[PDB]
């Protein structure tokens, strides 16, 4: 009842591109042409249509046709699917290239009994697919280069002995995107050829026999992926782009016409954050605060990013129209930091992962943000589902840093900033299975060019249920708390520049949350048994809310295996138990640290919050690890985590000392001296203070890279010996 729509869809498109012009009562020859083109993936025909192509089923010497009247002696001599040279006016198929593509097929009685012709026809169709269609959306590409390479560098040469020419066979190294750059026709042939073998039922088995990797590709591509190709092709068409924009503009017409003034004011301040105003900041500053603002070398501290540094710095300039540093001021600045933040709603949601009630900001602003959010939530009430259309893809241009600053640091090739580093790419695609949107996604109806720092191009498949708001500029504002499943990640070329296309499908946030919850439950069964804790204890927690969601979860495991394989099993158990006894937690999250209870719950003042890659909270006996960022030159998260476990070791040892109080062993005079001496030998960060030095040192000593283990030994021996004492002390005592 739904397959028939497909046959229905066929006849439709046929009506156009398929034009018969024969002698032998067309009713038959035509019937044959339908049975032949019926084997070809429906969407390839609509794509051919989209680019103005046409299929002509004529009689006799094919070159004896209007469309082929102009063919140049060179393009009059072809080569069949097998490489055998032929003469056009003697063959039965030909696909004319150009800004007015032509497919001419010689009307023959049988194409069934003749598995050879059919193969060739499909080969010229495949040639159309790769050369005339895919080429308009920059493909085949890297994904295909992969199938090609797998074929050659595979021990079984029979793969090559079927799809590659000798030109490809000889080529030494793998085929790089560069190769393809100046060999498009080469790849297109192979593509076309494999498409051919696949399409023609008889030669399909052969493909799957000697070139499985190829079969697979062409299989997946024709059974699904292709439809996305058609989608991208359409996105290139001006009229298609606008026909789409209109239907949607229409589906939300009432919603818009009825939208109030305030309504628009909200949608507006949600797209462009309000920066803090001097006349207010200055005005707010208490008498002493305002005064104290003059003895400050703002550039002194660190918790103030350059933007903030400069901003603050210009506050003096207005006050001057008149007549390191202490911690009382350090306090003053930790206070102003909060006040000089832009009022950025979506930002607020991302940072809190949706917990808009977090006491990580001053009550009044917390409230101001809640009011507006509860409102936008009310405004974005009408769902996208409509009778004006079915599947609807929306696009979003994203910055890799938003998901993982660490990989984002080496995403673009440093020699050619137009290419994407296959290395970081692979690592980035690795465990990216699901994503979550805690703030309002602002997507485009039709895909648009990106910004420089944006090398991520999302193609999202909305659910009819998904609510959204329409913007005049052709952008939709989706409702918060969306669930997204990653369906495909690949490298693509667009505008002589490489991008990572992410193909995602919207699903119920709960479905994703359940996965997170099931995982957190699983990870404890495992590490409770390893560490030997009570079967049902809650040690590790996944506080995952943002877009690189699944990853946070999959890296927690790996982080721990590292933690394990580098530190003494008995040190792990002794300290870990200490933590559990105090309800401690290993928190892996993607929301900024000042929004994790484990830290804010035990805060004195709010301005005393810390956001970083890692953090240890004695009061909660928990270790927090923020995944989306990049630790100050930490190779990876494993290290940062261990560094924190150092602060934990410091916290237990000190306790074992004088059990009557929670003091750090890193505070003992004996250590305050080792630090005063060797405390400048290891990482600069270690130079901060004893606790950080102890941890920095503790970390290097347990690095997966011994080169680093040696550094401590021959640079901070007095320390390397200290830490090792503390290790035995804890292990035994």
């Amino acid at each position: 009842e739904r397959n028939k729509t497909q046959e229905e869809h066929l006849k439709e498109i046929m009506k156009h591109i398929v034009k018969i012009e024969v002698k032998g009562e067309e009713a038959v020859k035509k019937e044959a042409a339908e049975k032949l083109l019926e084997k070809v993936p429906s969407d390839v025909l609509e794509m051919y249509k989209a680019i103005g192509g046409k299929i002509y089923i004529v009689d006799g010497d094919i070159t004896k046709h209007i469309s082929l009247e102009a063919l140049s002696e060179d393009k009059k001599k072809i080569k069949d699917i097998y490489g055998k040279d032929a003469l056009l006016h003697e063959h039965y198929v030909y696909a004319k290239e150009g800004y007015e593509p032509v497919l001419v097929i010689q009307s023959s009685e049988d194409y069934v009994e003749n598995t050879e012709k059919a193969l060739n026809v499909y080969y010229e169709i495949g040639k159309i697919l790769s050369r005339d269609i895919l080429s308009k959306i920059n493909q085949p590409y890297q994904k295909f280069l992969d199938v090609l390479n797998t074929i050659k560098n595979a021990s079984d040469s029979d793969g090559q002995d079927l799809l590659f020419t000798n030109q490809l066979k000889e080529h030494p190294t793998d085929f790089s995107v560069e190769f393809l750059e100046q060999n498009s026709n080469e790849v297109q042939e192979v593509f076309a050829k494999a498409f051919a073998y696949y399409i023609e039922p008889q030669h399909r088995d052969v493909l799957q026999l000697y070139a499985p990797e190829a079969f697979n590709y062409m299989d997946k591509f024709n059974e699904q992926e292709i439809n996305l190709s058609l989608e991208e092709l359409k996105d290139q068409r001006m009229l298609s782009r606008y026909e789409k924009w209109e239907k949607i503009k229409q589906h939300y017409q009432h919603w818009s016409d009825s939208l109030s003034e305030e309504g628009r004011g909200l949608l507006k301040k949600l797209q462009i954050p309000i920066e803090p105003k001097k006349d207010d900041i200055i005005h707010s500053l208490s008498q002493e605060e305002k005064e104290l603002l003059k003895r400050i070398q703002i550039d002194s501290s660190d918790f103030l990013s350059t933007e903030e540094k400069e901003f603050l710095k210009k506050l003096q300039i207005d006050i001057r129209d008149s007549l390191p540093l202490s911690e009382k001021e350090k306090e003053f600045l930790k206070k102003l930091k909060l006040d000089i933040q832009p009022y950025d709603i979506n930002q607020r949601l991302q940072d809190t992962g949706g917990l808009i009630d977090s006491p990580s900001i001053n009550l009044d602003v917390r409230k101001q943000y809640k009011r507006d959010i509860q409102n936008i939530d009310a405004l974005l009430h009408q769902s996208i589902g409509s009778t004006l259309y079915n599947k609807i893809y929306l696009y979003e241009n994203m910055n890799i840093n938003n998901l993982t600053a660490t990989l984002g640091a080496d995403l673009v090739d440093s020699t050619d900033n137009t290419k994407i580093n296959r290395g970081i790419f692979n690592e980035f695609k690795k465990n990216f299975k699901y994503s979550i949107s805690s703030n309002y996604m602002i997507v485009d109806i039709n895909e648009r060019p990106a910004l420089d720092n944006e090398r991520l191009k999302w193609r999202i498949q909305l659910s009819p249920d998904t609510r959204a708001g329409y913007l005049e500029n052709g952008k939709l504002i989706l409702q918060r708390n969306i669930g997204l499943e990653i369906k495909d990640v690949q490298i693509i070329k667009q505008s002589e520049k490489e991008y990572i296309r992410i193909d995602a499908k919207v699903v119920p946030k709960s479905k994703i949350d359940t996965k997170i919850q099931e995982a957190q439950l699983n990870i404890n069964q495992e590490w409770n048994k390893a560490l030997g804790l009570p079967k049902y204890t809650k040690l590790i927690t996944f506080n995952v809310h943002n877009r690189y969601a699944s990853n946070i979860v999959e890296s927690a495991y790996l982080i721990l295996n590292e933690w394990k394989n580098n530190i003494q099993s008995d040190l792990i158990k002794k300290v870990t138990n200490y933590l559990v006894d105090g309800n401690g937690r290993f928190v892996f999250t993607d929301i900024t640290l000042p929004n994790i209870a484990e830290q804010y719950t035990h805060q004195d003042e709010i301005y005393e919050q810390v956001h970083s890659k890692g953090l240890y909270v004695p009061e909660s006996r928990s270790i927090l690890l923020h995944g989306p960022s990049k630790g100050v030159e930490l190779r990876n998260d494993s290290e940062g985590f261990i560094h924190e476990f150092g602060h934990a070791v410091d916290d237990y040892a000190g306790y074992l000392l004088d059990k009557n109080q929670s003091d750090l062993v890193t505070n003992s005079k004996k250590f305050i001296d080792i630090f005063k001496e060797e405390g400048s030998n290891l990482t600069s960060y270690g130079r901060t203070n004893e606790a950080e030095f102890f941890a920095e040192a503790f970390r290097l000593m347990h690095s997966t890279d011994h080169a680093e283990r040696l550094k401590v030994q021959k640079n901070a021996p007095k320390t390397f010996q200290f830490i090792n004492d503390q290790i035995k002390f804890i292990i035994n005592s």
Binding site: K613, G614, L615, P618, K630, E644, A691, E692, A695
Partner: peptide
Amino acid sequence: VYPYPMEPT
């Protein structure tokens, strides 16, 4: 609270 700060975005 003993951290290990990230790198300014």
